[PDB]
């Protein structure tokens, strides 16, 4: 399969991240893509290509315009206000609050933010557009008839909802790709989020869309970021009822239990009638991944890929989470390999 | 007027405050109570006494039990979790999120938090409790017949809502005082929040209660903390319909304008028929406040006090905001002076 990757991801290099009550160097760092790209290259998938330029039409079909407009200038406004640090939200529209949008930059960032553990820094916007571009190109390859393709996206995007950034995500790539596929002739598309964390952004974007089915395998939100979405009972709403399938799982879940979930989701997706599947690939489910509590081993990522591919429909793998350890590349490369069959 | 002050306020001495993307020394620090207490004693208000011991019965009538339970052990669980910095929420139940409560510390701290600019530190709970004692005691004084009293509360509490902390607040001292007055025999009590910021926590606690009226004057939320509550449109709900009155004002607002809103707020308080008024006093409205944009002069506080006292009903002044310059002590004493007549 072809690999779409943009060097512009490096433009996203924030120096701080709120964690454990401290500002530390962001976990979703640049070296992540370097290794992923290297591990997959040696896996035989060395047909890497840069993405082409794209407008904002596709993304404007899945994200709020005010939200996008906010991102493009957030940093400039932030620095203009005179802040010495990076842009980090402090106040949030939580329970029983007004729906109005603040005019001030300090209020807007909070309004368009679901988690303070992510900071907007110089380049973030341009970086996000490029990662989005990789997703669009990957989607185009599926639309052209390619059986599979991998968009090495960075920054990731499954936590970016309709009008909010966080969880290290700004533009929901997986969602723009799903939208792209539709725009190219698909009537029904499915998104499968295997990343450790619930793809709360993706869920929100398609909760009321009946043309897209969302399935996510993640850690019980009762005790894992994002904490406020991902419960089994969230099955959709209104025009999108029945189109969301969450599979929350407790600590120590092994592939035995995890794989059963994968099986069930694939069933619901098949019953949904998806013409293709956008795979939100996050390899943070690895037993040796710092911020995660599932017990998956590297071999399992080969099973994961093969299994999803066995669906018989075209697949577009989109990069999401997975950090720290040097096995990230290997694990990602194994999912691609399993997909290759 | 009697002055209630506890030394255990010093127990609250956080080391960090997320401001402008950096963790800086908290604005609401111990040096505040020291200055205020010294200024009021120097203005004659030297009959200072420590609060008596009080249970949780009163506070449990304005705050959620779950929330209170959370605060008491928040710091213990945070350190026991392994985090290095202070307890700061990173994830927030924002738009379209589940109403479910997380089980881990990371999830609960966000669930019960409306702003990340406030961290839970060791001793915070005990401090918050003493501060609450000072309000209760001050309340009993009003119930005993005193026409005025001053509860030098710290930490402050007007930003603490039913089940969430923030804005340097954890327990809504003013709210507890109001409840106290009603438990002592009152049937209709009003709370006047002159603090620069909106009393989002207070408004939230009595929003659906008809026995309490809430009037607040504050920097327009469209561009001032907390940003998500305080618009004129917010007048109450259900059983509390019509019992909330917000008076938001723009940048550089001088007393010549601020005072006009005070006269109207007082007028609505009279129409409400309040038997007494708990005045949430924040002096951050001062023209020199490091984080507010109002242009009130030290002398105005004397006018403010005299005007509020002219209400004719008993007044309980509960300390809230006011930062930076030492004039905070002067400004606070000028209100007690204007109230004392
Ligand atoms: K997931
Ligand atoms: K106020
Ligand atoms: Na949907
Ligand atoms: Na009320
Ligand atoms: Zn993840
Ligand atoms: Zn204040």
List, in order of start, the domains of chain B with CATH numbers: 1-341 (3.40.800.20)
Write the Ramachandran bin of A82: left for phi over 0, alpha for psi from -120 to 50, otherwise beta: left
Substitution target in A97, A114, A115 with the highest count of B β-carbons within 10 Å is: A97
Please report which residue ranges of A241-326 form alpha helices under DSSP H. Answer: 255-272, 300-309
**Which run of H or E residues covers position A23?**
strand A22-24
Q: Quick one: which of B228, B276, B267, B225 has its CA closest to B245? A: B267
Any CB–CB contact under 8 A between B229 and chain A? yes
Cα separation, A232 vs A243, whole angstroms: 12
User: What is the b/e burial string over B184-201, where b = at least 16 CB atoms within 10 angstroms of the residue's CB?
Assistant: eebebbbbbbbbbbbbbb
User: What strand order describes the sheet that includes A48-49?
Assistant: A48-49, A2-5, A148-152, A315-319, A277-281, A189-193, A212-219, A244-249
Neighbours of A146 (CB within 10 A): 15
Q: Which two tokens mark B155?
A: 């930490």
Q: How far apart are the first and last CA of chain A?
A: 11
| CA B107 remoteness from chain centre | 25
Strand spans (E) along B179-309: 189-193, 212-219, 244-249, 277-281
Specify whether the CB–CB gap between B139 and B177 falls below 8 A: yes
R_g of chain A, CA atoms, integer Å: 18
Cα separation, A305 vs B229, whole angstroms: 47
Cα separation, B247 vs B75, whole angstroms: 36
Residue list, CB under 5 A from ion ligand 2: B 193, 195, 216, 218
Specify whether the CB–CB gap between A2 and A150 falls below 8 A: yes
Cα separation, A101 vs B37, whole angstroms: 39
Write the Ramachandran bin of B167: left for phi over 0, alpha for psi from -120 to 50, otherwise beta: left
Strand spans (E) along chain B: 2-4, 17-19, 22-24, 48-49, 148-151, 189-193, 212-219, 244-249, 277-281, 315-319
Any CB–CB contact under 8 A between A169 and chain B? no
Q: Which residues of chain A have a CB within 8 Å of the CB of B90?
A: 18-19, 115-117, 225
Specify whether the CB–CB gap between B262 and B304 falls below 8 A: yes
Structural biology method used: X-ray
Q: Which residues of chain A have a CB within 8 Å of the CB of B97?
A: 114, 200, 228-229
Which residues fall within 8 angstroms of residue A313, CB to CB, at 6 or more apart?
Answer: A274, A275, A276, A277
Q: Quick one: which of B232, B228, B281 has its CA closest to B115? A: B228
Cα separation, B275 vs A239, whole angstroms: 52
Q: Is A209 helix (H, G, I), strand (E, B) or coil?
A: coil
Cα separation, A136 vs A32, whole angstroms: 21
Portion 48-77 of B in contact with A at CB < 8 A: none
Q: Is A211 helix (H, G, I), strand (E, B) or coil?
A: coil
Q: Is A277 helix (H, G, I), strand (E, B) or coil?
A: strand
Q: Which residues of chain A have a CB within 8 Å of the CB of B102?
A: 221-223, 227-228
Indicate yes or no: CB of A92 within 8 angstroms of CB of B84. no
Specify whether the CB–CB gap between B246 and B231 falls below 8 A: yes
Which residues fall within 8 angstroms of residue B55, CB to CB, at 6 or more apart?
Answer: none
Cα separation, B19 vs B117, whole angstroms: 7
Q: How far is CA A205 from CA A159, A164, A202, A266, A268, in A?
A: 10, 10, 5, 20, 19
Specify whether the CB–CB gap between B182 and B210 falls below 8 A: no
User: What is the b/e burial string over B144-177, where b = at least 16 CB atoms within 10 angstroms of the residue's CB?
Assistant: eeebbbbbbbbbbbbbbbbbbbbbbbbbbbbbbb
Q: How far is CA B149 from CA A8, B140, B174, B277, B280, in A?
A: 62, 10, 13, 11, 12
Count helices and strands in chain A by DSSP H and E runs: 9, 10
Q: Quick one: which of B183, B188, B184 has its CA closest to B273? A: B188
Question: A207 C-alpha vs ligand 1 centroid, how far in Å?
Answer: 15
Angle at B205 between CA B202 and CA B208, to 5 degrees: 120
Q: Which two tokens mark A325?
A: 């350890």
**Which run of H or E residues covers position A189?**
strand A189-193
Q: Which residue of chain B comes nearest to A15, CA vs CA?
A: B21
Question: Is residue B25 exposed (0-12), middle (13-18) or buried (19+ Cβ within 10 Å)?
Answer: exposed
Strand partners of residue B165: B113
Peptide bond into B226 cis (omega under 30): yes
Residue that the structure tokens 């890497």 belong to:
A48
Stated in angstroms to one decimal place, the resolution of this structure is 2.5
Indicate yes or no: CB of B88 within 8 angstroms of CB of A18. yes
Q: Which residue of chain A comes nearest to B117, CA vs CA?
A: A90
Any CB–CB contact under 8 A between B107 and chain A? yes
Q: Which residue of chain B comes nearest to A89, CA vs CA?
A: B116
Nearest chain A CA: its distance from B128 CA (Å): 21
Which residues fall within 8 angstroms of residue B260, CB to CB, at 6 or more apart?
Answer: none
Specify whether the CB–CB gap between B323 and B291 falls below 8 A: yes
Instruction: Write the residue in B91, B95, B113 that is nearest to A225 by C-beta.
Output: B91
Question: A245 C-alpha vs ligand 3 centroid, how far in Å?
Answer: 10
Cα separation, A154 vs A156, whole angstroms: 5
Any idea what DSSP says for residue A215?
E
Neighbours of A183 (CB within 10 A): 16
Q: Is A142 helix (H, G, I), strand (E, B) or coil?
A: helix
């Amino acid at each position: 399969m072809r690999v779409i990757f943009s060097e512009d991801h490096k433009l996203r290099n924030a120096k701080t991240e709120l964690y454990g009550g401290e500002l530390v160097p962001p976990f979703e760092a640049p070296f992540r893509a370097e290794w992923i790209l290297a591990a997959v290259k040696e896996a035989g998938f060395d047909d890497v290509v840069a993405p082409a330029r794209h407008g904002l039409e596709t993304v404007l079909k899945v994200h709020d315009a005010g939200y996008l407009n906010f991102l493009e200038t957030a940093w400039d406004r932030w620095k203009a206000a005179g802040y010495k640090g990076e842009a980090i939200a402090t106040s949030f529209p939580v329970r029983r609050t007004s729906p109005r949008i603040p005019t001030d930059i300090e209020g807007q960032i909070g309004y368009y933010c679901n988690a303070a553990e992510t900071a907007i820094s110089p380049g973030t916007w341009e970086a996000a557009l490029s990662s989005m571009a990789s997703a669009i190109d990957g989607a185009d390859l599926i639309a052209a008839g390619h059986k599979a393709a991998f968009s090495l996206c960075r920054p990731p995007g499954h936590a970016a909802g309709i009008d909010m950034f966080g969880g290290y995500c700004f533009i929901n790539n997986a969602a723009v790709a799903a939208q792209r596929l539709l725009d190219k002739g698909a009537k029904k598309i499915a998104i499968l989020d295997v990343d450790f964390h619930h793809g709360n952004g993706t869920q929100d974007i398609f909760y009321e869309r009946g043309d897209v089915f969302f399935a996510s395998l993640h850690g019980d939100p009762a005790e894992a970021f994002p904490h406020f979405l991902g419960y089994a009972e969230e099955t959709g709403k209104g025009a999108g009822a029945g189109t969301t399938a969450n599979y929350p799982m407790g600590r120590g879940t092994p592939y035995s239990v995890w794989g059963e979930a994968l099986t069930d989701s694939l069933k619901r997706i098949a019953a949904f009638g998806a013409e293709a599947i956008v795979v939100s690939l996050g390899v943070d489910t690895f037993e040796q991944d710092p911020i995660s509590f599932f017990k998956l081993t590297s071999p399992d990522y080969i099973t994961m890929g093969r299994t999803i591919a066995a669906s018989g429909v075209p697949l577009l793998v989109v990069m999401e989470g997975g950090y720290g350890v040097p096995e990230i590349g290997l694990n990602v490369a194994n999912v691609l390999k399993g997909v290759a069959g």
